[PDB]
Design a binder for this molecule. Structure first.
Ligand SMILES: Cc1cc(N2CC[C@@](CO)(C3CC3)C2=O)cc(C(=O)NCc2cc(F)cc(-c3cnn(C)c3)c2)n1
Ligand SMILES: Cc1cc(N2CC[C@@](CO)(C3CC3)C2=O)cc(C(=O)NCc2cc(F)cc(-c3cnn(C)c3)c2)n1
Ligand SMILES: O=C(C[C@H]1NCCC[C@@H]1O)Cn1cnc2cc(Br)c(Cl)cc2c1=O
Ligand SMILES: O=C(C[C@H]1NCCC[C@@H]1O)Cn1cnc2cc(Br)c(Cl)cc2c1=O
Lengths: 478, 480
């Protein structure tokens, strides 16, 4: 049973929810966690969605090695990578790192494979795990030392084609969150200080966690331009015979998405899993003395529902009371519970309870499959709409810096007109950190949203008083 | 490809996998890049196997890639890769990259399993593992990092665990025979060849005629209660008594792709069985001197739509910057089962010319007949690839009765099926003797498996090596 209340002790609530729902197991190596089937099935669902979509775009999957040579990674202080230095008791002549990302593994191959315009575009993806051995405190799903992800890497003859792909991928990430996970996200461009330094422009989808007021980056898609093509000599002869640099993109999204989903939809009773990704969509709980009447009808119902492609489990485990099973599956977040006891059997009905609201329905056995499909569609949409309402309520539009600290104290983000000077972003981070100290606490840019309201002529930047350029979203962050 | 498969087999294999764009080389020895053309086949067999194990109630999971020194070694270290530093700082205790996940998963199993209500526990994961052997690698077959799936189950009874071992082994037979069209032999490993941590190891074995070697294709172990004792995986039964779980584990890797390549490839390159071909039919418009360009391209689009309506996986190669002859050779070296050519004449005739990759046979087919006729041809290709490979397997196994027949059979690049007493001392002696005789003429012959399909053992039959009473017919040969 979940005892910590989500609004009062959010961090303990999160730990309880992910452990008692059987999503994670702890491990002796800090920063690494076991992903149990209840969570892994959600990853499998989003992976299938995204993989099907990128295949429609002509992206093909591949698999590159998990190791990169020291001289290829460092193309005098090491990055925060895990170094393999020995095989058995024998030192390697040159240490090798576990991939933190695969640019330095893939791009030498791209340089070999690309020789002429005929070879472009080149569009590859891989599903793997990466390792980033940061010394800070980990958080399951959200910030871990090893994590599962997909990384896409493309090369094109023109920047326009590369940018088109950047935006198509970002739209797929919006769909991953909004359509599969029912989590609303905001598409935007990263500031110069926050973008990937190896690239030209970084686009992002950002999510908001109301309980701690923090934004979190949900996925990323980069227009790399020609920087990496210069560094790796990825050149092609054009249709007229001149050597040119390719224009590249890269993009990724991780199991952080599951953590965002958990935090968005969970409640005081535990998880709430959107029907589109739930391992089990309907749990059948026989109200049981096993004559065979009740479980016979349950097996018939499960067969029937599975013909409608509903993911069903009958919980016929012994020595647990019905109420125990009800709470067990509520903590796990199954979106629908189907109760079948003796009175139900006598009437030819079943009692269906939806997890998000607790509303109960008496449904005849015949109406079961269509009514349950309808209810799952309603649950999915209601989860999304309520989360989107909370997102809207969490963003305050401001004009001057003196509004910032009140908004941050309300656990809100701010949308502010900004001159986009990177010096000013560093100054704002320092000032908000120190104001929080006197009163991390730093506010930073989350993104410059694609959806720009008009910028009235003469609008001043909320911090510098210089002419504002764009409306920018700021907040405390992960 | 220019090397002949029947002359320089290793060189043929390297040319086949490079020129088909299946692999790319890499600067760290023993690791290779799996390019999209190879990864497509992997995706097909992964989907088959994952669908089937899900039907059995096995659920996917993901455990960490790292194992602490004290948990792995629960002296001289094993052939694992050791992480010793994060950045410039030494780890307080070094950690290994997984070579397999027993030591990572089983402490969790011990925590999770409390009563019979928790059993059976059936988990699988798709991942890569690392085995840092000092020997020469071979792409797909023997590499230092490789992709695989490892399944690990726990049961209340040995009977249930053994039933699962055999169900999984049958899935591996289907992975090879139904998907890859590679015939395999199910069997039990000898005492000297089985997984030491388990009670009985079952296997599927394939045969490579060009070098006379058996190769283990996949494995499924009855672990019994050994790991349950080691990791304290116990459960309370219905009577309230504490008992040990009965476990299984099982795995299969991208070695399967290399076995497919070696089995079906020919002097022209790869031959992909239709059931694992991401492109089953390639349509090639013959464009020359601007003769009917628009008509030909429109018709190719129509044909692709029609064939896709029949679930045939079709690609039109309308790339303007390659000639038709180049396209012919490209898709042939890549092993696409069927090539469909449509030129000006064919547009006039209402026909298309189709060539099958395995035999080269050509067919003129009316556009209306295309879908059913191509389905029929793909069934024929899949069946023929399997049947020819099975005939080669049959021809490569000699039944023997005495050790004096062994060296002539090995020199014919064959396996031997011999009656054996099953004494491990005798397997060790046979390995040494056959290596020595080979040297005089690696060359050691070992057991590959004791097949499930046992012919009768006539009373009084003597072991082919020791002269003691034979127990079972055993398959032996040179091996990978
Ligand atoms: C699961 C995951 C996802 C992502 N990212 C980033 C990119 C993105 C965006 O969505 C996606 C690929 C594109 C994503 O998912 C980043 C990390 C991560 O930085 N891990 C290392 C680590 C370990 C640790 F023990 C502690 C901390 C730590 C503690 N405090 N701070 C400030 C850091 C960090 N981890
Ligand atoms: C791809 C793959 C698959 C399997 N196995 C084994 C089990 C099985 C059976 O099918 C499946 C999981 C159950 C499978 O696929 C074993 C290896 C492997 O031993 N790698 C290490 C290595 C690296 C290296 F550079 C050289 C050598 C080397 C050279 N000569 N010798 C005698 C060894 C070995 N590799
Ligand atoms: O990983 C990236 C850039 C992009 N790679 C492709 C997938 C999407 C992703 O945003 C940025 N990044 C992030 N963290 C890193 C940590 C280390 Br350690 C190293 Cl060496 C390198 C990096 C590093 O390059
Ligand atoms: O890996 C195994 C046994 C089984 N594990 C589950 C998947 C199927 C597989 O056959 C045997 N094995 C093989 N090679 C190994 C190499 C090293 Br290095 C280590 Cl430490 C351990 C092992 C080791 O245990």
């Amino acid at each position: 049973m979940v005892t910590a209340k989500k609004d009062e002790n959010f961090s303990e609530w999160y730990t309880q929810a992910i452990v008692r729902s059987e999503m994670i197991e702890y491990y002796d190596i800090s920063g690494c966690y076991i992903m149990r089937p209840w969570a892994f099935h959600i990853w499998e669902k989003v992976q299938r969605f995204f993989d099907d979509e990128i295949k429609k775009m002509g992206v093909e999957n591949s698999y590159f090695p998990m190791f990169v040579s020291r001289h290829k990674l460092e193309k005098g202080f090491s990055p925060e990578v895990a170094w393999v230095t020995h095989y058995g008791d024998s030192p390697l002549p040159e240490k090798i790192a576990i991939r933190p990302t695969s640019e330095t593994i893939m791009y030498p191959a791209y340089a070999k494979w690309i020789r002429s315009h005929r070879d472009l575009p080149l569009k590859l993806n891989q599903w793997c795990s990466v390792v980033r051995w940061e010394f800070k405190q980990p958080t399951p799903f959200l910030r871990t030392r090893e994590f599962l992800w997909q990384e896409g890497h493309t090369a094109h003859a023109t920047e326009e084609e590369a940018w088109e792909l950047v935006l198509d991928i970002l739209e797929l990430y919006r769909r991953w969150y909004e359509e599969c996970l029912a989590v609303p996200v905001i598409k935007g461009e990263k500031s110069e200080g926050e973008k990937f330094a190896g690239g030209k422009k970084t686009t992002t989808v950002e999510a908001f966690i109301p309980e701690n007021g923090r934004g979190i980056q949900a996925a990323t898609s980069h227009l790399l331009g020609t920087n990496f093509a210069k560094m790796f000599e990825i050149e092609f002869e054009d249709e007229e015979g001149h050597k040119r640099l390719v224009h590249q993109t890269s993009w990724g999204c991780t199991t952080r998405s599951l953590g965002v989903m958990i935090m968005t939809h969970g409640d005081d009773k535990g998880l709430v899993i959107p029907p589109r990704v739930a391992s089990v969509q309907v749990v059948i709980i026989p109200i049981l003395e096993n004559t065979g009447e009740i479980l016979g009808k349950c097996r018939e119902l499960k067969t029937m529902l599975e013909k409608a492609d509903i993911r069903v489990r009958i919980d016929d485990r012994s020595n647990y009371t019905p109420g125990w099973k009800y709470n067990h599956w509520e903590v796990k977040g199954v979106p629908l519970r189907l109760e079948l006891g003796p009175k139900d059997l006598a009437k030819g009905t079943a009692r269906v309870v939806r997890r998000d609201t607790g509303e109960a329905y008496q449904i005849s056995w015949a109406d079961l499959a269509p009514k349950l499909l309808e209810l799952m569609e309603g649950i999915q949409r209601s989860l999304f709409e309520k989360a989107k309402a909370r997102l809207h309520e969490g963003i305050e539009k401001i004009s001057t810096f003196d509004e910032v600290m009140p908004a941050l104290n309300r656990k809100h983000l701010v949308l502010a007109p900004w001159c986009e000077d990177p010096e000013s972003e560093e100054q704002i981070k320092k000032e908000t950190q120190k104001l929080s100290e006197i009163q991390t606490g730093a506010m930073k840019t989350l993104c410059i949203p694609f959806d720009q309201p008009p910028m009235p002529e003469g609008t001043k930047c909320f911090y510098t008083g210089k002419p504002a350029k764009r409306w920018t979203l700021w907040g405390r962050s992960y």
